[PDB]
PDB file of C-alpha atoms (C1' of nucleotides) in Angstrom:
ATOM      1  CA  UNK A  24       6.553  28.118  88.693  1.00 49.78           C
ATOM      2  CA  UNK A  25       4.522  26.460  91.229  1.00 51.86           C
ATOM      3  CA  UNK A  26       5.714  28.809  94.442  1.00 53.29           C
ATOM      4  CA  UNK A  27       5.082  32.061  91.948  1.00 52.96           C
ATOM      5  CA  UNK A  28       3.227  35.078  93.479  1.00 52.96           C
ATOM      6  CA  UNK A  29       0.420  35.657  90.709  1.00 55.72           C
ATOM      7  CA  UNK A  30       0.021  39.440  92.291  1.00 54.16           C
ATOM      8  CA  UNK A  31       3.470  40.205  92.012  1.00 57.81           C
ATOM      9  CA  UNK A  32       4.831  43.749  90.555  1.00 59.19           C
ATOM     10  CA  UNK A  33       8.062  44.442  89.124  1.00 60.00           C
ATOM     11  CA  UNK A  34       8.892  47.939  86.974  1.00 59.46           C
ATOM     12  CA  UNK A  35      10.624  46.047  84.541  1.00 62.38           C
ATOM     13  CA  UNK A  36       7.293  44.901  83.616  1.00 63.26           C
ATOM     14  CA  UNK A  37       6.493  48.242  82.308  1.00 64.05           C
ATOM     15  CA  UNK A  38       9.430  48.085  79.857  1.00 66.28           C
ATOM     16  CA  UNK A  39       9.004  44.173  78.814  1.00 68.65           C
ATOM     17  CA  UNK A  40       7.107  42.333  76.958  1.00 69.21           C
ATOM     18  CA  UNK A  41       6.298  38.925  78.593  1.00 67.92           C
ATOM     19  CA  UNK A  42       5.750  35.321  77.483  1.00 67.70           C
ATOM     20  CA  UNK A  43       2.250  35.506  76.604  1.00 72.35           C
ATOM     21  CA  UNK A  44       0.095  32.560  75.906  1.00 70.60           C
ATOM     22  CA  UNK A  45      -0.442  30.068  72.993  1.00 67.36           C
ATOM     23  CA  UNK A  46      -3.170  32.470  72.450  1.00 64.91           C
ATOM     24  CA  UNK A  47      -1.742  35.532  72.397  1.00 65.48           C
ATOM     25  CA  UNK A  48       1.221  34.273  70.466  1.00 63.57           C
ATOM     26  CA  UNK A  49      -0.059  31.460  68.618  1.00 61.78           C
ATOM     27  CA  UNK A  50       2.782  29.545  66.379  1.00 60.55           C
ATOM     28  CA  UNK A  51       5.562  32.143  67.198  1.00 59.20           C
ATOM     29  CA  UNK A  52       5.164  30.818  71.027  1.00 60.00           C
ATOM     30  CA  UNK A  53       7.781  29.641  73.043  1.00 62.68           C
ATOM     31  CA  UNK A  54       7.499  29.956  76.557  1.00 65.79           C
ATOM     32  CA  UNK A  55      10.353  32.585  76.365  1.00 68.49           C
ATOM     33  CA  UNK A  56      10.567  36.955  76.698  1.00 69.21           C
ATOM     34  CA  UNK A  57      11.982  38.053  73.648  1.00 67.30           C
ATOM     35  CA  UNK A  58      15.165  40.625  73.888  1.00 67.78           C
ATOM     36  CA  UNK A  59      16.331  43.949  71.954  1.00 67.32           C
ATOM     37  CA  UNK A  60      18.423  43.751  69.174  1.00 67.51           C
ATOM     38  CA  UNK A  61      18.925  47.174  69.433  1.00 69.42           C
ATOM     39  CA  UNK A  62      16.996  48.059  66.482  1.00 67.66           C
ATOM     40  CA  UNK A  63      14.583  51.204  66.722  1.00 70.03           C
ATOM     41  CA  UNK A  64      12.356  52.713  63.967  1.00 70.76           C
ATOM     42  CA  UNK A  65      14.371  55.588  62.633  1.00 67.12           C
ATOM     43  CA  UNK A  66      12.837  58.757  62.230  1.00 71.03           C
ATOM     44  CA  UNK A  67      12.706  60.895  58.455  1.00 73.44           C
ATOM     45  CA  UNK A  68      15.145  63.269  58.744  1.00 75.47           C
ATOM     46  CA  UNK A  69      18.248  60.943  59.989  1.00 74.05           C
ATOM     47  CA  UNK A  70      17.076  58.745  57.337  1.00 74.19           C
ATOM     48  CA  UNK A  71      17.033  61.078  54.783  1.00 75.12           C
ATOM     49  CA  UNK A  72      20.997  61.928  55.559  1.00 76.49           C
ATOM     50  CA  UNK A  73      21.487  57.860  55.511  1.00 75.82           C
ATOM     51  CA  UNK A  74      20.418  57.697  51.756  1.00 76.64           C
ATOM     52  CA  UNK A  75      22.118  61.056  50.609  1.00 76.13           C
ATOM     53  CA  UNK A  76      25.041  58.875  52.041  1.00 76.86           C
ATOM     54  CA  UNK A  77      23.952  55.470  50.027  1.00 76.22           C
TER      55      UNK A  77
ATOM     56  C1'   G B  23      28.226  24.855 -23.137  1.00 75.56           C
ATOM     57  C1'   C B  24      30.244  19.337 -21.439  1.00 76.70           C
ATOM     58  C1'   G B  25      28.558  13.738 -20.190  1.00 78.04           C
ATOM     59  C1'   C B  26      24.315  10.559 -21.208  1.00 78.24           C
ATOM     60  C1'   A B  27      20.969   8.030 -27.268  1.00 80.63           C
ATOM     61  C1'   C B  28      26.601   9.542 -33.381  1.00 82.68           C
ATOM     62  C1'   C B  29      19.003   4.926 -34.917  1.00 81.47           C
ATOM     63  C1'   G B  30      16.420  10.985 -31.164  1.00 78.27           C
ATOM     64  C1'   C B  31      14.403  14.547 -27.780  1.00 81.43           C
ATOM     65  C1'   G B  32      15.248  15.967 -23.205  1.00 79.62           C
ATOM     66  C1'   C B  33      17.961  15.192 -18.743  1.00 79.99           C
ATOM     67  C1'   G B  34      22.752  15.811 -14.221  1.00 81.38           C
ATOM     68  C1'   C B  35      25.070  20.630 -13.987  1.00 84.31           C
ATOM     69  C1'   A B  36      28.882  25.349 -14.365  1.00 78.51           C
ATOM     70  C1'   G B  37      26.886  29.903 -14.674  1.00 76.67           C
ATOM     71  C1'   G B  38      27.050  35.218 -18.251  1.00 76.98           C
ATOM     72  C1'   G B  39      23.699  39.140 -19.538  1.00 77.64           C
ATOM     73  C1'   G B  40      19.133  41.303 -19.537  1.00 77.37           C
ATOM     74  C1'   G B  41      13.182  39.892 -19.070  1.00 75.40           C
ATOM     75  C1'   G B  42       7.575  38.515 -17.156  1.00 77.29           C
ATOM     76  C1'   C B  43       9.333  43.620 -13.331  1.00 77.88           C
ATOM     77  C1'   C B  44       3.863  37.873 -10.608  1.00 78.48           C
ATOM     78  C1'   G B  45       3.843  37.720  -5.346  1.00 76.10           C
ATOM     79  C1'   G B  46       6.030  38.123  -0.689  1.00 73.29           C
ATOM     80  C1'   C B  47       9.526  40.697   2.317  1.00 75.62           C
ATOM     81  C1'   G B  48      12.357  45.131   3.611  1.00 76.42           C
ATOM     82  C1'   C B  49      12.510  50.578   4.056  1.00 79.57           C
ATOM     83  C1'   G B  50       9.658  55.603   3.225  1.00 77.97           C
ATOM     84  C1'   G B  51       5.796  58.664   3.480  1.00 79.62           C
ATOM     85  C1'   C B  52      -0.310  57.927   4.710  1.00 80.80           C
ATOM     86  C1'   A B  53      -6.028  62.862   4.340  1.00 84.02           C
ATOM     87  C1'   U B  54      -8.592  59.348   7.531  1.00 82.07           C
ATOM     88  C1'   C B  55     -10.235  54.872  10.257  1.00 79.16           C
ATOM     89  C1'   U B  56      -8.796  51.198  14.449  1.00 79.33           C
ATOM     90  C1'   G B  57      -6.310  49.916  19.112  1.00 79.88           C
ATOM     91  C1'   G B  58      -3.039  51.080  23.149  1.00 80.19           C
ATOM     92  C1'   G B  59      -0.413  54.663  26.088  1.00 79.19           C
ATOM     93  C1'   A B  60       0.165  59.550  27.511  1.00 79.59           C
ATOM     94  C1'   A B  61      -3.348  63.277  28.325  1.00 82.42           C
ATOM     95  C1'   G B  62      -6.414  68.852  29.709  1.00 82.16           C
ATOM     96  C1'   A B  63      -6.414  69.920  36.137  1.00 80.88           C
ATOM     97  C1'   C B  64     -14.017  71.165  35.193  1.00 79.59           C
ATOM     98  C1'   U B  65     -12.890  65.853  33.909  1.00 79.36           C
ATOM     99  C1'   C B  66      -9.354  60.762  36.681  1.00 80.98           C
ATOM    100  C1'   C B  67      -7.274  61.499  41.461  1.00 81.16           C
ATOM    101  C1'   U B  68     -10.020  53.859  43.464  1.00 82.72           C
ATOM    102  C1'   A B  69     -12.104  56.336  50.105  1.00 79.03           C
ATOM    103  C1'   A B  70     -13.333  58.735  54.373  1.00 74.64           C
ATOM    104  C1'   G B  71      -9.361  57.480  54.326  1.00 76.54           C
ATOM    105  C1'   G B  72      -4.777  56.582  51.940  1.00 75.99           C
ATOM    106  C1'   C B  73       0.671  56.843  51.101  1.00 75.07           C
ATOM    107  C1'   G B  74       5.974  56.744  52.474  1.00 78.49           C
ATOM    108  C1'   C B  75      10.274  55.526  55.535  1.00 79.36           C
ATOM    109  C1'   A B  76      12.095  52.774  59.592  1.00 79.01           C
ATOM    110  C1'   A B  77      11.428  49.034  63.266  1.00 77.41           C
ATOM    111  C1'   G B  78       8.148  44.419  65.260  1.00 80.34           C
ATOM    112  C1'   G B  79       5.498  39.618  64.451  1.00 81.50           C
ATOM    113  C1'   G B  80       3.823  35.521  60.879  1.00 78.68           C
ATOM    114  C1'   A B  81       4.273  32.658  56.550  1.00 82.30           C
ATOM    115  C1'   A B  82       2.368  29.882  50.238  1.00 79.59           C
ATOM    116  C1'   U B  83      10.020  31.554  52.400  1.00 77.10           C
ATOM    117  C1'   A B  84      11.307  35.185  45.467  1.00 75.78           C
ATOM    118  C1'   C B  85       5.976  36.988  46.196  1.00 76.36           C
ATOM    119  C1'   C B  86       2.782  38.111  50.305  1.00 72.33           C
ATOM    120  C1'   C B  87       0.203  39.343  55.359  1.00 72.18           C
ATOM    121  C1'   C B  88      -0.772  42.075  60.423  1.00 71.61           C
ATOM    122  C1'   G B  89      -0.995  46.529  63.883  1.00 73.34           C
ATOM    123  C1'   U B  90       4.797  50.757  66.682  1.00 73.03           C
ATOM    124  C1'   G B  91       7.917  55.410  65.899  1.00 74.24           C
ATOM    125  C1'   C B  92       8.393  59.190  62.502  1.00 75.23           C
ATOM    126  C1'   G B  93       6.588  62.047  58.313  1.00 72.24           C
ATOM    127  C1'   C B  94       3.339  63.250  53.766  1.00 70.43           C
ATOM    128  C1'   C B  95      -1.455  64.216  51.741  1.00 68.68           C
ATOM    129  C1'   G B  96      -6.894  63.794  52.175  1.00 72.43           C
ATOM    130  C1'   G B  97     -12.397  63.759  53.955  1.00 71.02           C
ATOM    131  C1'   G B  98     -15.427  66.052  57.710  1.00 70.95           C
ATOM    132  C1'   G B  99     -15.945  70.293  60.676  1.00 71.09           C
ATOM    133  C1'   G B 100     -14.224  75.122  60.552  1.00 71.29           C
TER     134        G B 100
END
RNA sequence: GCGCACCGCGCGCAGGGGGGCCGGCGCGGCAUCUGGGAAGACUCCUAAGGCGCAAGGGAAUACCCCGUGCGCCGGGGG
């Protein structure tokens, strides 16, 4: 943390969200990035055959 | 009709059959009036925006709140 590069570029920073700030995430902050669950918003129709199925 | 005063009524109670059919309660209609809901699509349809589903974040942790992917309607313009 104190030998970082602040102008440093990775491409996983286009497909992350990072740590933020105490600002930007207020009482849900840790100093952590979050991860994927593997959850997605489904979309209507595949959702529609899920609840002819339930 | 028994017990209580065999110098008395009435009383404690078992309950027959009908009565005053007095009022409440129950059920049935009730032309209207009253209230609520539904309601006509001219009407009301919460606004120029809203709604749904699925994910994401936060909690008064039963409720609720905020703005990503899919859709559904709407206003405006046309």
């Amino acid at each position: 943390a104190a030998e970082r590069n602040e102008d440093e570029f990775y491409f996983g920073m286009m497909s992350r969200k990072g740590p933020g700030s105490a600002l930007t995430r207020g009482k849900g902050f840790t100093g952590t990035v979050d991860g994927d669950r593997g959850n997605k918003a489904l979309s209507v129709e595949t959702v529609r055959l899920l609840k002819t199925q339930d």
